[PDB]
């Protein structure tokens, strides 16, 4: 039972960098840092008042309880590296929906075609404007799945490996989680600068392998 547990071990030294709460790189916690960064970039709130208080505490620099809860929800032990895209997917059902994404599933010639609106805070789709190939149609051609409409704020999580691509080919977003191999960072679109633990270093999206993006209409 989470409330019974010692959180003191998860009190990672934190800072404010470009107005964002960030954790010092220690104990393989980069996954925690970029998960929490994208929650701030997306401006997400939790359905539970108890979780939302833990989140507000994290942002004001009382990080231990919300960080522990992340480890606890995801089944990760202190000092173990993990997966931000997994953590974000597991966080999704706890977050108040604040937007939607329309996914077009089509063939180049239009043999078969559809659109579906997804209204979860975290949606798994291509982070590229051109989309990804995804399964064969009854007529016998491979489907392309791409994001074609953005309402409010969603976090799009790539269906695949981290993606290296000329920056213009990515879905338009405010922030891009990048993975190098591993170690997680966040490309800030506004500044063109990179959140790497508790420092702000220059970076290039064209060579950043992107795993997820905060999209906002």
């Amino acid at each position: 039972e989470f409330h019974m547990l010692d959180h003191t071990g998860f009190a990672f030294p934190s800072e404010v960098v470009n107005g964002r709460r960030v954790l010092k790189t220690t104990d393989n916690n980069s996954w925690v840092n970029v998960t929490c960064l994208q929650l701030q970039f997306a401006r997400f709130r939790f359905k539970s008042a108890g979780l939302q208080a833990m989140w507000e505490s994290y942002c004001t620099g009382d990080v231990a309880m919300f960080v522990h809860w992340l480890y606890w929800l995801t089944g990760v032990d202190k000092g173990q590296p993990s997966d931000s895209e997994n953590a974000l997917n597991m966080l999704s059902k706890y977050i108040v929906p604040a937007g939607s994404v329309t996914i077009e599933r089509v063939t180049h010639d239009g043999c078969c075609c559809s659109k579906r609106v997804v209204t979860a805070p975290v949606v798994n789709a291509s982070v590229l404007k051109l989309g990804v190939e995804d399964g064969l149609c009854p007529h016998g051609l491979n489907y392309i799945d791409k994001v074609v409409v953005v309402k409010g704020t969603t976090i799009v999580v790539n269906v695949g490996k981290p993606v290296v691509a000329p920056s213009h080919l990515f879905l338009k977003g405010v922030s891009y989680t990048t993975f190098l191999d591993g170690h997680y960072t966040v490309f800030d679109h506004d500044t063109g600068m990179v959140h790497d633990g508790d420092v702000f270093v220059p970076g290039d999206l064209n060579v950043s392998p992107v795993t997820n993006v905060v999209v906002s209409e």
Binding site: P81, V101, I103, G135, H183
Partner: protein, 76 residues
């Protein structure tokens, strides 16, 4: 029934499953064919990550459905 899984190398495999098969059971089947340990598998269907303890029926996964396999990242 038959469903399809898009593997890490972009090729498509076939699984023999029932609607009442758990996501753990589907992951065990991908492990048999792909060698990817269940705890390292993330399965995507209709933009959703599938949860352990739930079944294919809970997500309305019908025959000739294509799941997407994504390998777990270790970021420190």
């Amino acid at each position: 029934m038959q469903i399809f899984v898009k593997t890490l190398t972009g090729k498509t495999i076939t699984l023999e499953v029932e609607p009442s098969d758990t996501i753990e059971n589907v992951k065990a089947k991908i492990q048999d064919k792909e060698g990817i340990p269940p705890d390292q598998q993330r399965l995507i269907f209709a933009g959703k990550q599938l949860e352990d303890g739930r079944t294919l029926s809970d997500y309305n996964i019908q025959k000739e459905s294509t799941l997407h396999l994504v390998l777990r990242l270790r970021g420190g």
